[model samples]
Target: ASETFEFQAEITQLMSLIINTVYSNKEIFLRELISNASDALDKIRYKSLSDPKQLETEPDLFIRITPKPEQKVLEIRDSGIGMTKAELINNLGTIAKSGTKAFMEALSAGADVSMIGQFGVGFYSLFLVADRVQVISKSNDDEQYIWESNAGGSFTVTLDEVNERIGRGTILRLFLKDDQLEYLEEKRIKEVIKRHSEFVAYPIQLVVTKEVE
Candidate 1:
């Protein structure tokens, strides 16, 4: 479909439970996002090396993180393959089901669609820890689109004003809820990155408010 579709009620409730309860540690949210970012960097790095001249400028595979203290919003951005409208609906709306044939067969056989996003759903894990989540991404294939949800039963993907905020990459912003505020700490993020992503080929940078003069 050209337009993005939202999750149904049953699917929404199932999503809430799976997201809020299934994941063990909320801290893993950062790890998950970072890991995804690292993978994205790897994809682009290879592509750029093979065709650097054709590409405008090579994107640094590193992840750039920023914490919005005033809003308690944490943003992790990366230069990666972004999503289009159809891709967004197919990727985010549906859960455990993947592949065109399997997805269609599952529907015909009456398999549970609740888990359609099981594999791609890690991106949704931020909601387990955050009250709201926003994804700003630009695809090499299409225009930039934003996917947003609050673990609310429904998600919305819309055309973003690329000139204003988003560019040719993905920036995931998390509005941390009461219990998830621990993720806002610089010390904690850096420690977690070092532990889980020390071997990441791309550099990971944290944007700090207290920059040295």
Candidate 2:
């Protein structure tokens, strides 16, 4: 069944601060997200070390960045450890209960930001360039699920039965903001990837769709 969740008080506040005040380096949004993708990939790789079945279906692990200019959507996908519905709700829905309070405190005090993951609030930075985001993921233990939000007051998660393109891992489909159109460009995306994640452990490919008759 599909479920909708309200943002916890501190999560709402943290999102507002992220979009409005926290990061002056707008491009760091991409950097943050890419780092998350790599983390997921690393997790799965480690798990497979003990339980080889974890990578049975999808052996190769990599990240793909696809730009659909027609839809103004940027999709960053990884063949990594995907989340179950409960995991989604826990990992995404309740960040406020996790470490947002201290994250906000650090922001207000202008503490060293290199320790961003310490607070686990980097995901909210997606609001910097996109008005809306849809995270579609598939996991070994559960069916595919979709998590959607606009950094508004609420978010929703639905059971996706038809879209099975994502066999495993998470796909972040970002509906870019109007002023963030630059992110739709391969050149711009490449620059950010080159500058921030060039030496990433997993392979990162730019998937550009071209129609030819």
Candidate 3:
């Protein structure tokens, strides 16, 4: 059997507040999520250190995005530690930890982003720009599940029936708000990647046209 976790109510309210602040840049969502994906890639790379065959057949552990204007969908996918049913609640439902809270407190009392990334509170920021966010995660430990949230102060998690080939990672689909339509532009996204995450360890590519080989 697998372990299950739940989110406390206080954590939920705090997450809602953080989403409001986290989506201010809108561009930062990419940086944060990519940064998160980069971390997951690092984890898999390190796992290969102990057991090389532990990873999937795909060698390139990078992030990819596909945008559809007609559908108004922006799909951001990554190969990382996707969540289980319980983990979906524990990580998404609850605010995870007080790291963000403490960071803000320190900022209020005079702290900086220098040591802020330690808290690992990057994912909560997606709700600001996304009217709806869907997360498909597959953990090496348990069954894969997709967690969906509208950032309307509530979220729901269910087993992912749409997952056919998500080997061992997470894919996040961000439904951009009407006001944030600029994010669908590849050129704009390229500039954003260069500005905030050009030096990122992994490669961040954009999808100019539809996926056609």
Candidate 4:
């Protein structure tokens, strides 16, 4: 069984704008997601410097992207600090209660471009391309858990019984929309990576496929 919660009224409005009006380019979703993954990796790396034992188990910090055209799926995997059950609810399920203030506040403050994520809504951008998004994560402090939603007003989070373990970090599986087929292309993915993430502090690799030349 899974738990579900309604989105705050403010979040509902924000989502309306996101899903209905804003973000014309679906390609930007990949950039935002990769940037978020990089942020997570930075946190873990910073902490590990003070405590060498932190990296004992997961020695590597990187991001891997896999595109499954046949299944209409795009997966992003990262070895970084994963989120806990509560964090998932607070960050993904609710709005305005995020790391920053209400969406209106951000706009009212004359927020700069960097303020795009002041409300911690970067993860929601996943819904721009994916009709349903699934997140499976394993953190050092807690057991594996799964969070899923269809970009709706509600979401569900439950314990991972099969223990689809990653040891430490997060994996995001995007069940892409039918019309969003451009993302499944190897060339398109690489172009987006270079344009948005080439300077990312950590390495980002896409699984290579040999062409039948």
Per-residue error for 46 in candidate 4, Å, reads: 0.9
Show where candidate 4 strays beyond 4 Å: 22-24, 98-115, 209-213
Measured against the true structure, the TM-scores of the candidates, in listed sequence, are 0.76, 0.91, 0.80, 0.85
- Please report, as a residue range, the 10-residue window in candidate 1 with the lowest summed lDDT: 96-105
Which ranges in model 1 have alpha carbons more than 4 Å from their true place? 1-4, 8-14, 22-24, 53-58, 95-120, 162-167, 211-213
Task: Compare candidates 3 and 4 on TM-score and give the better one.
Answer: 4
| Candidates 1 and 3 compared by lDDT, better number | 3
Tens digit per residue, CA lDDT, model 1, 1-213: 123456754456544654556433556667778877877766666767777742443344557899887898999988765556677676666553334334335545754433333444456556667778887777676777777777775677788764244445678978887766777889988877777566776668899898688
Best by TM-score: 2
What is the lDDT, from 0 to 100, of the residue 171 in candidate 2?
Answer: 92
User: Which model is ahead, 2 or 3, in terms of lDDT?
Assistant: 2
Please provide, for model 2 over 126-205, each residue's C-alpha lDDT reduced to its tens digit, 9 standing for 90 to 100. Answer: 88888789999988889889998888888899998656667679999999988788988888999898887777899998
> lDDT tens digits, residues 148-187, model 3?
7766555677776675667787888888878778778888
Of 1 and 2, which scores higher on TM-score? Answer: 2
User: Across residues 1-213, which tens digit of lDDT does each residue of candidate 4 receive?
Assistant: 688877776676655555653334557778888888999899889988898887765788999898888799999989988888888778775645554346546655665423455556666667667878889888887878888877677878988886457868998989988878788888899888888677888888787567699
Superposed on all Cα atoms, the candidates' RMSDs to the truth, in angstroms, are: 6.0, 2.1, 4.0, 3.1
CA shift of 176, model 3, Å? 1.3
Clashing pairs in 4: none
Q: 11 in model 4: Cα distance from truth in Å? A: 1.9
| lDDT agreement with native, every candidate | 0.67, 0.83, 0.68, 0.77
- RMSD (Cα, Å) of model 3: 4.0
The order by descending lDDT is 2, 4, 3, 1
